[PDB]
Amino acid sequence: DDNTEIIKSFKNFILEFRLDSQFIYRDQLRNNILVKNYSLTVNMEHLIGYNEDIYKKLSDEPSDIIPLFETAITQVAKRISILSLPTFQLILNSNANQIPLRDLDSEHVSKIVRLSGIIISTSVLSSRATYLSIMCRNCRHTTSITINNFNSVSLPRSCLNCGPDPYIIIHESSKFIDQQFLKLQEIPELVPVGEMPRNLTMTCDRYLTNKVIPGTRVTIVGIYSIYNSVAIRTPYIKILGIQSDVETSSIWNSVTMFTEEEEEEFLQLSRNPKLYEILTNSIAPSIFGNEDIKKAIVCLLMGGSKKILPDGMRLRGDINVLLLGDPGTAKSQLLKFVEKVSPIAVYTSGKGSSAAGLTASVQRDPMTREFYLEGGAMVLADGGVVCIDEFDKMRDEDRVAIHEAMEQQTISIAKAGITTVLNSRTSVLAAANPIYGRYDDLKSPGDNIDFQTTILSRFDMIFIVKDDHNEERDISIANHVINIHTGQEENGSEISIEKMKRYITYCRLKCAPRLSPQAAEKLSSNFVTIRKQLLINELESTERSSIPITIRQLEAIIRITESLAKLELSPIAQERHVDEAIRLFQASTMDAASQ
Amino acid sequence: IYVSPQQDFSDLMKSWKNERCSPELLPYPHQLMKRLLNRISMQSQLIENISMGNESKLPLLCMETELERLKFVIRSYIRCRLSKIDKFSLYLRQLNEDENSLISLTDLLSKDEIKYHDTHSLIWLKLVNDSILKYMPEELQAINDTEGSVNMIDEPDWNKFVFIHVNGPPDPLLQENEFGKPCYTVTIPDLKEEVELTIGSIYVMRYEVIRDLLRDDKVALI
Amino acid sequence: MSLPAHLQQTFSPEEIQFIVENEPIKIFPRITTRQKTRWQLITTDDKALNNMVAMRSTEVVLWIALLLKQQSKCSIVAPQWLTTKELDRKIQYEKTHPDRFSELPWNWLVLARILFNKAKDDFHDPIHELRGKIQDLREIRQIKVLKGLKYLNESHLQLDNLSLLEINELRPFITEIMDKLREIHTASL
Amino acid sequence: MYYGISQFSEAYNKILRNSSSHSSCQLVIFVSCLNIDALCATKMLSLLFKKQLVQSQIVPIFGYSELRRHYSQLDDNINSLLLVGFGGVIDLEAFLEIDPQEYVIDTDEKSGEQSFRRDIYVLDAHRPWNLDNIFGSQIIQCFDDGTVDDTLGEQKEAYYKLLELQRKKQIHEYEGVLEEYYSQGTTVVNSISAQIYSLLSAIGETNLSNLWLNILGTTSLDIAYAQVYNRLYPLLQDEVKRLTPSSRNSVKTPDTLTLNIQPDYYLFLLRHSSLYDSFYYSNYVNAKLSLWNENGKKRLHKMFARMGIPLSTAQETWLYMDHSIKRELGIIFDKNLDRYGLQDIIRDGFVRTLGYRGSISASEFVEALTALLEVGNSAQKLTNLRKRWVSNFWLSWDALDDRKVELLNRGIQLAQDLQRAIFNTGVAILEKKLIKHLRIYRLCVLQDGPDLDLYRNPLTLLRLGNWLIECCAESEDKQLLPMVLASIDENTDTYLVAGLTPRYPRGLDTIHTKKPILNNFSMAFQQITAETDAKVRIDNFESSIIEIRREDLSPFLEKLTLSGLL
Ligand SMILES: Nc1ncnc2c1ncn2[C@@H]1O[C@H](COP(=O)(O)OP(=O)(O)OP(=O)(O)O)[C@@H](O)[C@H]1O
Ligand SMILES: [Mg+2]
């Protein structure tokens, strides 16, 4: 009765909506059916413009009208693609105000809401039924049921004598769809005073599955509903749309999510003669000086290139950076910026961490009594960067639990039957203090550093930041900080965080330069000289150097060269990059070792 | 055979479309182009004369716009012809060098086109002989060799597929089909197949087979 | 070289519009040029323009008609195939004959786009209805083209009553795929 | 000379007759870079000339120096020059060094008139007319709106007699009346767009787009010269009623264009922001509630609570707001507003809808255009800034085309940003009590604000000035006193002073409120600059705005206070 009229109304929107000379939804449908994507994304501002009455119904009773807009889409799709196809999914976009995760309460039950959060977990896909074929136990009578996944359905209780519940499902004739579960945590800043962050369970269907990964900020449009698991119901959100700032699909598979128009911008930016300067200036615009550390951070974000030799050996392609220095140097602020610019990043404190917190931990499911594996900081940061602050407060065991994941980029587990070798391809950016809090020049370098040579050799570049009291520099820093406190270039000398992050993603998924012979000869000669320099320094002092120079440093120089080449989308690394890489190595690691 | 300016424009457009879609370099319509250029000059002089001297505003606008249209058509036609000459320079040189061949460039090209062909060939040969060919032995020193592993002279794609519209005569080759409609019969020797080309229909045919019909104006490429 | 790579072997949409704009159309002059200066053209006929009378049907080239309409000195008379009823009939014909294309003119899409853009007050039917009908017809013909593309082969192929803009859209794919098929077949022998 | 209301057709025919030949361009239009009324009038004229195929050139122009430069750089093939939005007050013949003899083409003794190569047409709404242009010159042709005939007879008589010349007494009294006429201040009496629309109606080319542009031009004067808008409103209402189709029973279609006269409100961008933000960022609401302090916010929250609108609902954007409250807004507002003194928010305005798109009102369209003009994007830096503003002119001009809607949305966003910045700056000004209340005028000088780069544009400075004029100056039952606002820019170490006329309490019809208030700052500023070695720049079209050096402001203001002519 009314259902047919509602279906007719939503069908006329898809067939009559033109903003100029193009039918936006009719053409979107045809283009989607051609690539086998049975869905239509509709913007709710367009529906409020066609007929406000249709929006009033879709917002007053969402779980009753949404199922009738899907069938209208399916009918129009059949009319457009078939010359005389499952039920089509409807994905919604809205610009309504976002309700804070913790402000959702009884006043929003069964209503369309928009909210943001952080995805902390994702489930293994399940299978939900969409068309059952049933039969009767006694008289063997065949029937079918059709189900929409919008709850306010079960097998018939009485046959069509036959006892109660006479119907058994015939599986080889039924059809199913995909279902996923997500946990959404509220943003750290939104949380009220003295409160732990709160979770919320979410479910997505069909083409909204496998769209997010744990640890990524997302925006959700859905229905705040309830399901019975006494007179209380556990709330949850039925997703109707997902929007994210991270192209997770490009990151897991190939290069994707870059439009040709967007791609053209990246090539134009790469063609800039002084992209290195722009990127260096774009990191921490509010921190004065420390240019070398900012260049090192650019190289770390860019990364090197990984090689798999024919015999099977793999060569690490990531760069690890350590910041040792005195208080007030802005190491923690640099780490907090790097966590915010990188596409994937985790900020962790060495004190509030553990060996299982990093890597992976073995957990027991209370229901199935079965042990399973949950990823830690280094798994949650896979393919990105881990910012381990307070690296000196970490316990010896928890620090030792990081060697293999830092070098081999794998997390071997052998616990509770579970036996595996996970993958953790992450870059470590660590900040630490010397033993006495300040780097005391009076005592030998072996007295100011408690890190063992094994852990230190795993860092590509080591920065020993010393705070020297110079009146000119002090006045400059005072002026800069006061300007910050009392007080937008965007004129080719700096790019916002979003653009820089997208450019990092593009470069990582598009380029992997290789060394030319001249660079190889140059780097090889430099390694021989540096090793001789360590030996002359060692012969002079009975004490064995605390900062080592092993083959890992040669590989680190190669990685820095490759990252500098990749920064400009150059398929080959030339001497103009080798010189910069050698300069950075001398400015950080040989500088630390010389003292 | 001159008929009227309208007919001359119609043949110009026919030639333009055929040249754009054809794989080979068609013969140059000397008389038509001569008439068209002379008419262009005369019409330009007439427009200038009239302009030198408000109801007369619109006619002048129309004449100038028509002159622009005609100039554009001729420009595109000549540019396409020059590009084709660039692609098939060695092939045309081979035609001229052979004496048994019927076609001669003085008939297949205009004076400007022949001048362009000779000058550009000389320029490119100078460049390549300086850069590369002067180092190779005497054997590999020819820019037009056909006895090597790969033939260096590019010939037109004879069997290229081209959309055609069968518009009939403005006839011995014409006949009727089972349904009674007029039609043409052609044979594809590669497949030994005979294909009917009924009038008023659109086909995607090989160029070689319908080449004679195109030359006689029985079909026109779209 | 002399010719860009995107204009080689095919025409651009502007070239198709240029070709379409030389066909005659019917206009109602708002001025009386007939005498009881003078047009002097060389690409078309000028007798019709020299003989115009207010509110009297006459035929001129499409581009001249558009130029006159820009001055509010003529009202273009839309073709007979571009009425609501005729488009309904063509849609029905397409629906009942899954294996053939309707007998629309070879310039229906281009002329529809030009007249909708330029002469919006010269139609006797609401413009939105005509736009919807043309969209429907385009979708049906697109379905038919998609179905018919499954019969590409090393021999000829026939696409009757397919318009100029659609053929221009499909020319690269069809020609290149059939050329590759022919190359494979010929290599076979 | 001057062209009466009925002579606009004659002037247009002259322009067509002379500067219309498909061989070359012979028309040039100069436009005030920062005047919306002139922008709309020039758009109307551009469409009108495009219809008749007249080749032209449009040159945006900031200040008189640029005008002189461009006129000097004009070619000799230009037959007609159009000036829109300026030129009436200055002496064009003297200023541009125009010698009538040099510009003469042919002279006929029998006719008694001379023909000139060039003609200059003045489309200006400012007053008073410069009697030299109106009555003495012939190359200058001024588009009058009846003032010369209504209220300039005695001045005409005096000027003609003075040119025609015991006699010392008559000469003295005539120069005295002329000086009395020149002593009065400057004001705007009409809208240029209305004049161009009258021309179009005279020649019969009025349509819906032209009416939209006319409405935009006329409504651009609502904020300042409300008394002109109130006078021109009935004609716009009649035109909208005449052009609109009688029957509206037809349903919306993707092409339907609607132009209604619905209840509008004195709220800032009501239809593109929340109901809360419209009240919060409104000049009138802030004036009548003092939102710049906490008590004002408490009072606004009390008002919303009384009206029955939840705070969460009010802060929701316009499109997605609960529709029951949206429908009832007219009823809820009418009973509730009178209690809080915000009753005059109720108004009737123009709303235009394009099928299946959001409906936008004239006031919000004007706000978007102005915002695009303002923030759309030694002498060298000044020239660069003026070039940037000339660039912004074209963004604002593009925003007038229905094919460019992204530009309009971008303008609305920028307008919201600018209003937020103006609110913050006004809060900083009022909290610190930076306004000095002297006996002749009020003064306010900004020296260390946080967003001082914004106020280099005269338009943004006038926006802030209007905000201040409404709040705690229009109200408080204080005597009407003109205000001076100045701002500094370290990049050039100079001030941008701007005198502002006082305004009567809004929506208070009275005999004294009926009388208009003039702006005398031009005369006093010029007198002081001439007397003192000021180094002042008086090149801006609005004579009330000048530029001063960092170290001259104190002497300038001392002399201003001592002048007594304010
Ligand atoms: N250019 C700057 N250089 C140094 N500190 C800065 C700078 N700009 C701001 N700061 C201040 O630095 C403080 C952050 O501490 P910072 O990151 O410098 O410590 P750290 O040296 O890494 O740590 P710790 O003192 O524990 O060794 C913040 O208060 C920030 O205001
Ligand atoms: Mg710290």
Ligand SMILES: [Zn+2]
């Ligand atoms: Zn049973």
